[PDB]
Write a protein that holds these residues in place. Sequence first.
Motif, mmCIF file in Angstrom:
data_model
loop_
_atom_site.group_PDB
_atom_site.id
_atom_site.type_symbol
_atom_site.label_atom_id
_atom_site.label_comp_id
_atom_site.label_asym_id
_atom_site.label_seq_id
_atom_site.Cartn_x
_atom_site.Cartn_y
_atom_site.Cartn_z
ATOM 1 N N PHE A 27 5.709 -13.625 27.451
ATOM 2 C CA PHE A 27 6.342 -12.349 27.678
ATOM 3 C C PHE A 27 7.075 -12.391 29.006
ATOM 4 C CE2 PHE A 27 2.501 -11.366 25.102
ATOM 5 C CZ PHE A 27 3.179 -11.064 23.938
ATOM 6 N N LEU A 28 7.950 -11.450 29.248
ATOM 7 C CA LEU A 28 8.709 -11.434 30.487
ATOM 8 C C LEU A 28 8.511 -10.062 31.148
ATOM 9 C CD1 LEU A 28 11.100 -11.575 32.583
ATOM 10 C CD2 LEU A 28 10.740 -13.779 31.490
ATOM 11 N N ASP A 29 8.209 -10.053 32.432
ATOM 12 C CA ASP A 29 8.024 -8.815 33.191
ATOM 13 C C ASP A 29 8.747 -8.936 34.536
ATOM 14 O OD1 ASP A 29 7.074 -6.277 34.029
ATOM 15 O OD2 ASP A 29 5.110 -7.033 34.594
ATOM 16 N N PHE A 30 9.024 -7.824 35.166
ATOM 17 C CA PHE A 30 9.796 -7.789 36.402
ATOM 18 C C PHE A 30 9.105 -6.925 37.438
ATOM 19 C CE2 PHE A 30 13.873 -9.527 34.921
ATOM 20 C CZ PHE A 30 13.859 -9.270 33.567
ATOM 21 N N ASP A 31 9.158 -7.346 38.676
ATOM 22 C CA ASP A 31 8.663 -6.536 39.783
ATOM 23 C C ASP A 31 9.662 -5.441 40.105
ATOM 24 O OD1 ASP A 31 6.995 -5.832 42.089
ATOM 25 O OD2 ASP A 31 8.707 -6.514 43.192
ATOM 26 N N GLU B 227 -2.519 -16.886 32.646
ATOM 27 C CA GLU B 227 -3.690 -16.031 32.490
ATOM 28 C C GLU B 227 -3.391 -14.835 31.580
ATOM 29 O OE1 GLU B 227 -3.778 -15.774 37.038
ATOM 30 O OE2 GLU B 227 -5.898 -15.821 36.543
ATOM 31 N N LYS B 228 -2.213 -14.264 31.736
ATOM 32 C CA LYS B 228 -1.842 -13.063 30.996
ATOM 33 C C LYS B 228 -0.801 -13.393 29.909
ATOM 34 C CE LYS B 228 -2.045 -10.704 35.499
ATOM 35 N NZ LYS B 228 -3.450 -10.272 35.485
ATOM 36 N N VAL B 229 -0.315 -14.645 29.911
ATOM 37 C CA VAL B 229 0.718 -15.136 28.960
ATOM 38 C C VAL B 229 2.076 -14.394 29.211
ATOM 39 C CG1 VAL B 229 1.196 -15.694 26.469
ATOM 40 C CG2 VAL B 229 -1.168 -15.619 27.286
#
Length: 95
Positions: A4-8, A69-71
């Motif tokens: 998955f992709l996440d952003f700060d 850890e969270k993928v």
Amino acid sequence: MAYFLDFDERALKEWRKLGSTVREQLKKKLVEVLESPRIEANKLRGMPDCYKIKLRSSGYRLVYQVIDEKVVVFVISVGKAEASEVYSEAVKRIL
């Protein structure tokens, strides 16, 4: 395997600040990188699992951590890296 992709939120400010075509290509890089986010050639050594991607166009860099850890791949910083200011976020964020 795809992650998955996440952003700060700090990265988001810079991301939305970034040139449309620049961020588009970085986004596409994120999309392609997801097939194998743990690319040694993109890896930052010393940094747990942080990787940098640079653009061919205007020389923008994006630094993200792959959280196995969270993928999820979490973008910590995006912008430019010749002043190493994006690493200041990366190194302090890892804890």
